[PDB]
PDB file of N, CA and C and ligand atoms in Angstrom:
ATOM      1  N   UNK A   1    -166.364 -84.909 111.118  1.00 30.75           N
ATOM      2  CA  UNK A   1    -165.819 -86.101 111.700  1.00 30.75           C
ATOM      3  C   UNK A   1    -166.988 -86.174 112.599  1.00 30.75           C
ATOM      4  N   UNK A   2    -167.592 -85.009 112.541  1.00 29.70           N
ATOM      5  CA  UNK A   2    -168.775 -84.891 113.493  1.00 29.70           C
ATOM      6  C   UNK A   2    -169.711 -86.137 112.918  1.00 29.70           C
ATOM      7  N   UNK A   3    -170.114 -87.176 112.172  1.00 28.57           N
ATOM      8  CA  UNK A   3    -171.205 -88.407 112.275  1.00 28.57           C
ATOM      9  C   UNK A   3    -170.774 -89.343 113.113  1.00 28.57           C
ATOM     10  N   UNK A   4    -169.204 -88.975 113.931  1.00 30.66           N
ATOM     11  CA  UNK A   4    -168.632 -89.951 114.240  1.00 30.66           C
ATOM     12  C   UNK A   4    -168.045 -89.749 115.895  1.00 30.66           C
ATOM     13  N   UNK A   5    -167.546 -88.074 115.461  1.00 31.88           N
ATOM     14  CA  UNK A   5    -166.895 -87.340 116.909  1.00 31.88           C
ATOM     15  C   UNK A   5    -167.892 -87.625 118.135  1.00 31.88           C
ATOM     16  N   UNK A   6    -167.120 -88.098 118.878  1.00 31.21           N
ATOM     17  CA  UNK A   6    -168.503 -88.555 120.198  1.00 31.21           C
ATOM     18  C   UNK A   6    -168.952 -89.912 120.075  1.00 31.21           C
ATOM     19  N   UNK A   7    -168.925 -90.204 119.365  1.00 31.53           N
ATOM     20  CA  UNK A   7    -169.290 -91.867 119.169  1.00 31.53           C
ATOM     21  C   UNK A   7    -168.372 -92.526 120.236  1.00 31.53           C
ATOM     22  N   UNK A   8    -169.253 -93.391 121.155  1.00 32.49           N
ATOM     23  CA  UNK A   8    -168.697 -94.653 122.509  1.00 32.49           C
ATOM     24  C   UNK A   8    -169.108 -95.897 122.565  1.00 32.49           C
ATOM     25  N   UNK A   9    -167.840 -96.239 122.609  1.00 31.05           N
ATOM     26  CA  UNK A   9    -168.077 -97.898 122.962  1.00 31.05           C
ATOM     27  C   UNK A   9    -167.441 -98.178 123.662  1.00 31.05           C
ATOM     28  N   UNK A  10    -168.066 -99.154 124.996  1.00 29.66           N
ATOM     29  CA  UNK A  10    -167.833 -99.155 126.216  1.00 29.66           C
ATOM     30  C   UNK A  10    -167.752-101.389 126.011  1.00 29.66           C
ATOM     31  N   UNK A  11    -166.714-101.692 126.835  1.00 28.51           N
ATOM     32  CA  UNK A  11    -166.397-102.813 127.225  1.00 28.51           C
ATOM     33  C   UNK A  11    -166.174-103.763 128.362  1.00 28.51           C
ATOM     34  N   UNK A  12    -166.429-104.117 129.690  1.00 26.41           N
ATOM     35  CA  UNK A  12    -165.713-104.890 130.621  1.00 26.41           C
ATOM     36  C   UNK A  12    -164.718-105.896 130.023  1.00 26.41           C
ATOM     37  N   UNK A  13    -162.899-105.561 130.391  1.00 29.95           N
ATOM     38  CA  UNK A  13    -162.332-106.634 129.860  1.00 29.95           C
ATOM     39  C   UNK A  13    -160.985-106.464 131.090  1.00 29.95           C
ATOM     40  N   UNK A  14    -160.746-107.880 131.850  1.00 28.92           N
ATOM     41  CA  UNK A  14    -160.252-107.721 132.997  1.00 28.92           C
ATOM     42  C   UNK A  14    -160.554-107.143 134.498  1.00 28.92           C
ATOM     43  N   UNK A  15    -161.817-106.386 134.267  1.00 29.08           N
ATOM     44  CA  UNK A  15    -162.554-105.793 135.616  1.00 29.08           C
ATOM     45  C   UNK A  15    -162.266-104.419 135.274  1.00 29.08           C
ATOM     46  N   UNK A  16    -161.660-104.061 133.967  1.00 25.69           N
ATOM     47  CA  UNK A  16    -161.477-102.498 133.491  1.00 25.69           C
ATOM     48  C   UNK A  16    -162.771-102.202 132.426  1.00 25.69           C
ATOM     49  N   UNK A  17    -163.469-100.867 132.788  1.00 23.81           N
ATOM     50  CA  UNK A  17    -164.284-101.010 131.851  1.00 23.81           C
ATOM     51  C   UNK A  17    -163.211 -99.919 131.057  1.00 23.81           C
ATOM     52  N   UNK A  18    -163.257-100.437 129.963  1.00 23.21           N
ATOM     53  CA  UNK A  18    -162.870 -99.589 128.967  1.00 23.21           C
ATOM     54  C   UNK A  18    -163.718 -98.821 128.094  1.00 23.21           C
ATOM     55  N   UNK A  19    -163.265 -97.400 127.221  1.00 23.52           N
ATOM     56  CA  UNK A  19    -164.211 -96.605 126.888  1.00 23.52           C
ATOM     57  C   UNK A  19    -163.550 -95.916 125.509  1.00 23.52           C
ATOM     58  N   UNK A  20    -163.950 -96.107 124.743  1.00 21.82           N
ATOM     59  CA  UNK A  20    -163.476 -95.152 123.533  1.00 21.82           C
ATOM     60  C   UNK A  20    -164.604 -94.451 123.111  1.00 21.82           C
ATOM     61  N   UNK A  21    -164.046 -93.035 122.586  1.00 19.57           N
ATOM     62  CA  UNK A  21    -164.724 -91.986 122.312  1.00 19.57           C
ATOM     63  C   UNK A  21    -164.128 -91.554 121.092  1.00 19.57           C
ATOM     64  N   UNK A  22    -164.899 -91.678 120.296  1.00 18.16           N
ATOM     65  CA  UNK A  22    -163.925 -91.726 118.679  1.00 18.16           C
ATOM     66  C   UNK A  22    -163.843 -89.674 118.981  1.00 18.16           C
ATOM     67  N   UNK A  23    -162.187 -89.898 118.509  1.00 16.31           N
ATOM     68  CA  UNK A  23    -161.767 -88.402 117.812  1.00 16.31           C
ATOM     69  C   UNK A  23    -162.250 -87.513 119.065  1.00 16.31           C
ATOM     70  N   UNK A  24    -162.273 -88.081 120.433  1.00 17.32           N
ATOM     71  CA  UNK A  24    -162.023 -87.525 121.678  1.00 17.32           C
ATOM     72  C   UNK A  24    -161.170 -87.904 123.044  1.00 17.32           C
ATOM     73  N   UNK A  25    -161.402 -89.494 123.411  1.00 18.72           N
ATOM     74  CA  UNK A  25    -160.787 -89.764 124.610  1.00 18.72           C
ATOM     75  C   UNK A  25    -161.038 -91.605 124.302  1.00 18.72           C
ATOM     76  N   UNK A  26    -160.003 -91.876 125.849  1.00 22.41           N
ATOM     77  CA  UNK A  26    -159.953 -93.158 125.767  1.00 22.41           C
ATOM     78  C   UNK A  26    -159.782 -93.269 127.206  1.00 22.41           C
ATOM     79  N   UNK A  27    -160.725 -93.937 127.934  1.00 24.44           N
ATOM     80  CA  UNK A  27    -160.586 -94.526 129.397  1.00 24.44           C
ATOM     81  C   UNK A  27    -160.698 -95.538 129.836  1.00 24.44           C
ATOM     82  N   UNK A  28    -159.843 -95.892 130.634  1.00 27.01           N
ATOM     83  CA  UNK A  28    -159.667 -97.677 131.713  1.00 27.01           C
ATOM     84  C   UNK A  28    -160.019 -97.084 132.818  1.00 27.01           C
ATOM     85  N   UNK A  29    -161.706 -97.665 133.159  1.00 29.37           N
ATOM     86  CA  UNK A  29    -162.438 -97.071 134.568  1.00 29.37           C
ATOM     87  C   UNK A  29    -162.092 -96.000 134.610  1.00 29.37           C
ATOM     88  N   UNK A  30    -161.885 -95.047 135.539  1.00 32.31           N
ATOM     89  CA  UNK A  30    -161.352 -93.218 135.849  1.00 32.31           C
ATOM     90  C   UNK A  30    -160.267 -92.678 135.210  1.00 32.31           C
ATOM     91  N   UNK A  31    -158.934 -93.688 134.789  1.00 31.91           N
ATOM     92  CA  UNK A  31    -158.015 -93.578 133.896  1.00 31.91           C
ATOM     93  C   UNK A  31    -157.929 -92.848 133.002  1.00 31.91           C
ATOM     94  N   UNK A  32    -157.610 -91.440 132.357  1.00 31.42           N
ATOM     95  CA  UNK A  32    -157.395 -91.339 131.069  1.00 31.42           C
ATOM     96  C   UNK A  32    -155.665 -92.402 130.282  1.00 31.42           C
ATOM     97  N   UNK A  33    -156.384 -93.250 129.144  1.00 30.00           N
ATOM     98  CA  UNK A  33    -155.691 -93.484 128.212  1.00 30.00           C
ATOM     99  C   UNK A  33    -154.433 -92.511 127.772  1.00 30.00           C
ATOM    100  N   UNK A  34    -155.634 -91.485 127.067  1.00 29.04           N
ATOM    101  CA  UNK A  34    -155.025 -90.428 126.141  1.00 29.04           C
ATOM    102  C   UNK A  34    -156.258 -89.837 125.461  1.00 29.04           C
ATOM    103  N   UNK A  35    -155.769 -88.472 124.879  1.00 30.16           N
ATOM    104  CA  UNK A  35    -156.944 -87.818 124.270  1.00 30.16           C
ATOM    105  C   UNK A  35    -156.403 -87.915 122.658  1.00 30.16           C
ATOM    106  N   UNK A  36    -157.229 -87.917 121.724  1.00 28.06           N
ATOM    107  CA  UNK A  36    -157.227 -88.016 120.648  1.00 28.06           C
ATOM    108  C   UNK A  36    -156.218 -87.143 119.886  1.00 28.06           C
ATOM    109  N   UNK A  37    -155.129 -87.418 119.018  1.00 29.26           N
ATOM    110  CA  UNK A  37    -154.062 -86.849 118.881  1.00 29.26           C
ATOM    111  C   UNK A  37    -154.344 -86.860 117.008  1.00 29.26           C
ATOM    112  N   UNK A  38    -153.962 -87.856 116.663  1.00 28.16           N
ATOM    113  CA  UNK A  38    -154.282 -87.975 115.024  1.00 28.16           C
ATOM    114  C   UNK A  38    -154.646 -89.394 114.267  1.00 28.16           C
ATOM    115  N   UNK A  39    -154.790 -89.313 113.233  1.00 29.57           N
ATOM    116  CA  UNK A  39    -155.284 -90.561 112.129  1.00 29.57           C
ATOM    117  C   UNK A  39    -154.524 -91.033 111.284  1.00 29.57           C
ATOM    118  N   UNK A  40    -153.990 -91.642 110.866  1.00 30.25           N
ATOM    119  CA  UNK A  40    -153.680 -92.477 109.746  1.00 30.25           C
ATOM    120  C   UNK A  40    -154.309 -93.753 109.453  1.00 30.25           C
ATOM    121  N   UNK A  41    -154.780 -93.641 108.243  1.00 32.01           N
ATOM    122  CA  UNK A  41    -155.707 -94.773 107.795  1.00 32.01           C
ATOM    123  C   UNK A  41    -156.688 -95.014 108.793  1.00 32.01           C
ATOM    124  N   UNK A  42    -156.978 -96.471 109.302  1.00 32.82           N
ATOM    125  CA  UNK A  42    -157.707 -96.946 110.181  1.00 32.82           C
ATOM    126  C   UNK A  42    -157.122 -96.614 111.200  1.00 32.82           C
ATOM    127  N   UNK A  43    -156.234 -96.200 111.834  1.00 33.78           N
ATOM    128  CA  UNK A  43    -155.620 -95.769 112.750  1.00 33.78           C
ATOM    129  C   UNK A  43    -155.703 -94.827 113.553  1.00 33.78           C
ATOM    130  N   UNK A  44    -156.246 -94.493 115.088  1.00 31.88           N
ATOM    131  CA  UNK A  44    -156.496 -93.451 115.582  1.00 31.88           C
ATOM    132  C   UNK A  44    -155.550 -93.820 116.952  1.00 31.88           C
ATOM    133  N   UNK A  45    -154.711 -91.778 116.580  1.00 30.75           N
ATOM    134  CA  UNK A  45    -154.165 -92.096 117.866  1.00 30.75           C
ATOM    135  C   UNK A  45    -154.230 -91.578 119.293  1.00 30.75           C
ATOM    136  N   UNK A  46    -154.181 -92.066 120.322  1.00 30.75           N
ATOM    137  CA  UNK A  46    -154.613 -90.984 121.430  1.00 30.75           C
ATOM    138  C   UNK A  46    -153.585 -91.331 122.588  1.00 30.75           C
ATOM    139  N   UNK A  47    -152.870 -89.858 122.811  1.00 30.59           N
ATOM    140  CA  UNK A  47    -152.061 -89.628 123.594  1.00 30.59           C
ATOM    141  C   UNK A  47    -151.782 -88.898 124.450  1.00 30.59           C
ATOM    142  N   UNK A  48    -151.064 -88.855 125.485  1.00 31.49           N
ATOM    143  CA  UNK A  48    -150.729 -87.867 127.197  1.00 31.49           C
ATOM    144  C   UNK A  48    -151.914 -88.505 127.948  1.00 31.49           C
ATOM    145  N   UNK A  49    -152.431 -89.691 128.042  1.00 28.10           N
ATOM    146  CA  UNK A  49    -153.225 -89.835 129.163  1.00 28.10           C
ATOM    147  C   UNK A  49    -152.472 -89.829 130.451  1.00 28.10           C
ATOM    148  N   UNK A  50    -152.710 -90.282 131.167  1.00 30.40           N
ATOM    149  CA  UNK A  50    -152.191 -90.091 133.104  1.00 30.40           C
ATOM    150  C   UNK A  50    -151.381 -91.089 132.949  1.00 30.40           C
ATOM    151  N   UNK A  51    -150.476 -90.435 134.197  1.00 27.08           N
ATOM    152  CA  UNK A  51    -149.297 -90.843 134.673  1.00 27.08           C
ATOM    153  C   UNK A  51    -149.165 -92.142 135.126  1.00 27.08           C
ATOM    154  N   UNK A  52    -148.343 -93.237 134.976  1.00 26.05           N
ATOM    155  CA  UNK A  52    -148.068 -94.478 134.801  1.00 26.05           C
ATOM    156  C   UNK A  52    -146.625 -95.134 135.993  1.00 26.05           C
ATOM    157  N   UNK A  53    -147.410 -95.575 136.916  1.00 25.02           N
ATOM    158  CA  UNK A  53    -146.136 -96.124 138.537  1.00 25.02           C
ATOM    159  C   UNK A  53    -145.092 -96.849 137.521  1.00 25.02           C
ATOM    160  N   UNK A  54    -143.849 -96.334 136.995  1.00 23.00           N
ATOM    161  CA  UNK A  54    -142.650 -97.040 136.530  1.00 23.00           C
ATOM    162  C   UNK A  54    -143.096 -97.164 134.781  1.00 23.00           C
ATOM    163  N   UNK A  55    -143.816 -96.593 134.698  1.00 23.48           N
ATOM    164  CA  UNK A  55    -144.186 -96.241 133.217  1.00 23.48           C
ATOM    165  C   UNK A  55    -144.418 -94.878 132.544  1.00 23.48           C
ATOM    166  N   UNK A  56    -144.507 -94.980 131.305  1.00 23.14           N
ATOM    167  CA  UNK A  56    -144.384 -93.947 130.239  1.00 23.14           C
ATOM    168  C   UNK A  56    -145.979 -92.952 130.574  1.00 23.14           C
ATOM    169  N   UNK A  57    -146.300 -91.977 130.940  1.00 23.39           N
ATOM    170  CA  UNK A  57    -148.000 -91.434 130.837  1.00 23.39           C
ATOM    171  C   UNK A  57    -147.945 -92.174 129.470  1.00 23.39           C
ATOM    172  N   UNK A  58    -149.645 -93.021 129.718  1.00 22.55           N
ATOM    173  CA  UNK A  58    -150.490 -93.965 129.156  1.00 22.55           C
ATOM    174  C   UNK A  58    -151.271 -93.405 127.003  1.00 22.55           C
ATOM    175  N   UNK A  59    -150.851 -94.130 126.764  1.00 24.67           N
ATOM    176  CA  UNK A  59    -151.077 -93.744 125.498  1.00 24.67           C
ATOM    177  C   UNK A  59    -152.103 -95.015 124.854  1.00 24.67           C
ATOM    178  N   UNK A  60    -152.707 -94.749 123.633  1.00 25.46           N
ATOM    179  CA  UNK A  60    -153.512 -95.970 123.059  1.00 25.46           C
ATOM    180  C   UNK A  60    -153.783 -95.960 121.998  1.00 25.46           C
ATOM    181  N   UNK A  61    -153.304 -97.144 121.109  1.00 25.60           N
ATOM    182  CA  UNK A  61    -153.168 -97.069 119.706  1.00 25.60           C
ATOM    183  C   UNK A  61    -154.768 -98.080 119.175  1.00 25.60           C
ATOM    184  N   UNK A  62    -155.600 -96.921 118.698  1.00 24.77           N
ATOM    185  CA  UNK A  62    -156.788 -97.514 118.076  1.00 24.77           C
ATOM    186  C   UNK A  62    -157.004 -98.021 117.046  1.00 24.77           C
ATOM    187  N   UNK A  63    -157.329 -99.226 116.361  1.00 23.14           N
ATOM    188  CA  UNK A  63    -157.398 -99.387 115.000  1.00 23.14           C
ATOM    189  C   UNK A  63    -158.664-100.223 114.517  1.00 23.14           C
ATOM    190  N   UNK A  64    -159.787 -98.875 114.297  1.00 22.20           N
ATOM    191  CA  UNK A  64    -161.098 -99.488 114.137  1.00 22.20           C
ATOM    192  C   UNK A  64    -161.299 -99.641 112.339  1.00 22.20           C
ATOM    193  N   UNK A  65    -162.298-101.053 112.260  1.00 20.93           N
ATOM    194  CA  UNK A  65    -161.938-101.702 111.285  1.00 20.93           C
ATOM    195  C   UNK A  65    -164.050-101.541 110.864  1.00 20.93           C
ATOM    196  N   UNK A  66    -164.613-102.188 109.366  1.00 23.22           N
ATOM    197  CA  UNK A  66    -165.517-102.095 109.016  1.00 23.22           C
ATOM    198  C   UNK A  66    -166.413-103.180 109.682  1.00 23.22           C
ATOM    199  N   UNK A  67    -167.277-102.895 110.461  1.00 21.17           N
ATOM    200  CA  UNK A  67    -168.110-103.661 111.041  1.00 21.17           C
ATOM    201  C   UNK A  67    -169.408-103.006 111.221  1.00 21.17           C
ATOM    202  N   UNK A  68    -170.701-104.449 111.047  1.00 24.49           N
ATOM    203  CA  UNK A  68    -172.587-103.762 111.707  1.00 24.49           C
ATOM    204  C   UNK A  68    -172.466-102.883 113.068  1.00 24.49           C
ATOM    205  N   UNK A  69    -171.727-103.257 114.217  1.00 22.52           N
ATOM    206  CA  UNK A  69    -171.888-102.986 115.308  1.00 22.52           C
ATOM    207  C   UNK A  69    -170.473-102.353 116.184  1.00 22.52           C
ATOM    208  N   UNK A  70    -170.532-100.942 116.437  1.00 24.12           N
ATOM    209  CA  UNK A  70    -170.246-100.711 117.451  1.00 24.12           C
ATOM    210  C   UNK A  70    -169.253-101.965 118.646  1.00 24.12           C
ATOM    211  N   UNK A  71    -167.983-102.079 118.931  1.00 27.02           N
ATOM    212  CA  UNK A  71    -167.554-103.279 119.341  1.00 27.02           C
ATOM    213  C   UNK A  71    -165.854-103.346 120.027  1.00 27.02           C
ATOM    214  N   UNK A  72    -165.753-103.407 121.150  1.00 26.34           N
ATOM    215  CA  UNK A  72    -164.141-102.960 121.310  1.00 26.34           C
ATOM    216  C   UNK A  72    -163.954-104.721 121.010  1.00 26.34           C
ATOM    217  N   UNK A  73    -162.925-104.976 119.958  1.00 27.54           N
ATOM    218  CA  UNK A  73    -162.444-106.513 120.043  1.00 27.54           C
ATOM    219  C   UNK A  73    -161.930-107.293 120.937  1.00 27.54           C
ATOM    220  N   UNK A  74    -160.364-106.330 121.173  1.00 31.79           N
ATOM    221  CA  UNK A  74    -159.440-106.313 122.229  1.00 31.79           C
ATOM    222  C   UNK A  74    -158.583-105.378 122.509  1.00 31.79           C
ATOM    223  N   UNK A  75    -158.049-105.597 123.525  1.00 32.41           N
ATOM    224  CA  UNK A  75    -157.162-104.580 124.350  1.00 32.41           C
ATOM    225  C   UNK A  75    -155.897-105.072 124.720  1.00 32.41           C
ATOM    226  N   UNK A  76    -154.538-104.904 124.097  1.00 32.36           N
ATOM    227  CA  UNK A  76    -153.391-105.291 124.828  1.00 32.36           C
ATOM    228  C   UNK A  76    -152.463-104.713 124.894  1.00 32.36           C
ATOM    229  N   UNK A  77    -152.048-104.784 126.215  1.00 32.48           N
ATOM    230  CA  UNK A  77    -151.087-103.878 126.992  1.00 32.48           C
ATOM    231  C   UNK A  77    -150.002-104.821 126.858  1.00 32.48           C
ATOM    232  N   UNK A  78    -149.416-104.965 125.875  1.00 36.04           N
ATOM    233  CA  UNK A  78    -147.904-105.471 125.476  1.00 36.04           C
ATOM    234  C   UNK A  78    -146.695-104.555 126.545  1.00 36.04           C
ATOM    235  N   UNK A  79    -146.578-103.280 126.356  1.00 38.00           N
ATOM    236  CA  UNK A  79    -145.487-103.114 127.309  1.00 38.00           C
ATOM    237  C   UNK A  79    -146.550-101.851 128.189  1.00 38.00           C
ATOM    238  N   UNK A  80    -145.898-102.087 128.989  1.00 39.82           N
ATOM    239  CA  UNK A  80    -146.597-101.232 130.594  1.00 39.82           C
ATOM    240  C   UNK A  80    -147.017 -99.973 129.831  1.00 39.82           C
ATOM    241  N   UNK A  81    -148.547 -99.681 130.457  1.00 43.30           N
ATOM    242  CA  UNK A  81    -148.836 -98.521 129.848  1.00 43.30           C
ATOM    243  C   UNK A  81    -149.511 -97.954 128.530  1.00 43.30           C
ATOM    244  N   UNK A  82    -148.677 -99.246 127.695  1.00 43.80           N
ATOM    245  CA  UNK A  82    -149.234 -98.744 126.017  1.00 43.80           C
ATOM    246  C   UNK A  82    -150.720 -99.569 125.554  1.00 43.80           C
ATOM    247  N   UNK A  83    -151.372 -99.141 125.109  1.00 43.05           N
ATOM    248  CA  UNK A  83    -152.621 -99.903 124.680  1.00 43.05           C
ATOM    249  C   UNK A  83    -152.757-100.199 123.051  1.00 43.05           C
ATOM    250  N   UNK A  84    -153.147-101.367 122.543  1.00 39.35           N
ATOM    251  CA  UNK A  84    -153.494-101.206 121.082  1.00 39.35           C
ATOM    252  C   UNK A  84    -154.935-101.923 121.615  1.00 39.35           C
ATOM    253  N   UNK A  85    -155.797-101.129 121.443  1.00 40.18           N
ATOM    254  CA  UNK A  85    -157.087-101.553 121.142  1.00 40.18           C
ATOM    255  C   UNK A  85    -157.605-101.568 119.402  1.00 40.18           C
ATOM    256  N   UNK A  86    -158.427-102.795 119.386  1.00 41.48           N
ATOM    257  CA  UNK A  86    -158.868-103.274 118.093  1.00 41.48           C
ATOM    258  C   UNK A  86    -160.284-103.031 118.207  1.00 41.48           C
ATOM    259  N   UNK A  87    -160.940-102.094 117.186  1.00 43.09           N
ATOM    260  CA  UNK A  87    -162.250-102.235 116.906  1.00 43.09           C
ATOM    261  C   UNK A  87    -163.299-102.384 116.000  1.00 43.09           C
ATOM    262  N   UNK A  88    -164.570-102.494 115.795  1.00 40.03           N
ATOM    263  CA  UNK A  88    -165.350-102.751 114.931  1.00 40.03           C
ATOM    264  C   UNK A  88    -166.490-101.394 114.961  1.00 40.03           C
ATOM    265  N   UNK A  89    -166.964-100.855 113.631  1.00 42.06           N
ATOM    266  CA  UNK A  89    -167.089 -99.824 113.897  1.00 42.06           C
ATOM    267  C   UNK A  89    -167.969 -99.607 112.847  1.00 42.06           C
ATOM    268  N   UNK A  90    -169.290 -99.099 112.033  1.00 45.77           N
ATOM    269  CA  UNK A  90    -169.567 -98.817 110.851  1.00 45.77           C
ATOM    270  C   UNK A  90    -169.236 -97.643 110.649  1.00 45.77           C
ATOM    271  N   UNK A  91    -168.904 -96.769 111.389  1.00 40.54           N
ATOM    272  CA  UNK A  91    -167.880 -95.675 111.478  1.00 40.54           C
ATOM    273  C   UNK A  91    -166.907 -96.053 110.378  1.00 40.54           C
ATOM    274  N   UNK A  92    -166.278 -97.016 110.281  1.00 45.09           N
ATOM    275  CA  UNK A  92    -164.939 -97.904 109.227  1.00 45.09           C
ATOM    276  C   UNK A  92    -165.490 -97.768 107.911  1.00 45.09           C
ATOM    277  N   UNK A  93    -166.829 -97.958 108.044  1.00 44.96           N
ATOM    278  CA  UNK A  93    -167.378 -99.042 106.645  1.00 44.96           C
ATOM    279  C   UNK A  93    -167.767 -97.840 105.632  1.00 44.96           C
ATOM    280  N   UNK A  94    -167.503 -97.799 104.354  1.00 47.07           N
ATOM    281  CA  UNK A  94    -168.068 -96.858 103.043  1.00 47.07           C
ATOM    282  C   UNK A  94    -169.108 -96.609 103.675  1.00 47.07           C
TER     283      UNK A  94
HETATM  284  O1  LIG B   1    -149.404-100.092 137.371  1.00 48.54           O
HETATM  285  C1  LIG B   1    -149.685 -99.791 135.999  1.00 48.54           C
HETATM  286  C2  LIG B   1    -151.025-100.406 135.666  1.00 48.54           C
HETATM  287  O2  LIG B   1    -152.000 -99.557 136.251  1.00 48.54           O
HETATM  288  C3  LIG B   1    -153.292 -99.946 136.004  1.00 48.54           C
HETATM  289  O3  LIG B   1    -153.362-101.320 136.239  1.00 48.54           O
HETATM  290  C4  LIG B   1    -153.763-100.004 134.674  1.00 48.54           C
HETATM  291  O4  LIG B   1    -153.713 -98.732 134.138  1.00 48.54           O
HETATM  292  C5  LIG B   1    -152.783-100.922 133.929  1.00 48.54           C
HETATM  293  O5  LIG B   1    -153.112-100.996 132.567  1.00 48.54           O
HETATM  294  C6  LIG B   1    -151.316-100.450 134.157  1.00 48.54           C
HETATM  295  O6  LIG B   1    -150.418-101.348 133.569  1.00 48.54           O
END
């Protein structure tokens, strides 16, 4: 997983820089997300990040897709705490 483990892509979106670290971590500025838990399909999941004021500790559902470039799409925090970030990745691609 190692052509991939360590691989970052970094974003400003809202004044948060966001940070994914394929098949290691996920951070909002100093924040841990969550640390890399498991895969299904395009799907990476990363969970137990830090503790959340009236929320669940912070979790983030990754789902990087076949793309040239390295690329966080978006980020949405639908309910307090939870993240689905969308990405682009040749990491994805055959
Ligand atoms: O107060 C909870 C709030 O804290 C920070 O803003 C960020 O981690 C947000 O994503 C989260 O919703």
């Amino acid at each position: 997983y190692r052509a991939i483990k360590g691989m970052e892509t970094k974003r400003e979106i809202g004044g948060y820089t966001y940070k994914v670290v394929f098949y290691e971590n996920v951070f909002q500025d100093s924040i841990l997300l969550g640390n890399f838990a498991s895969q299904e399909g395009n799907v990476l999941k990363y969970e137990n990040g830090q503790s959340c004021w009236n929320g669940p500790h912070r979790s983030a559902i990754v789902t990087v897709e076949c793309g040239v470039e390295n690329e966080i799409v978006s980020v949405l925090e639908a309910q307090k705490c939870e993240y689905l970030i969308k990405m682009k990745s040749p990491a994805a691609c055959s």
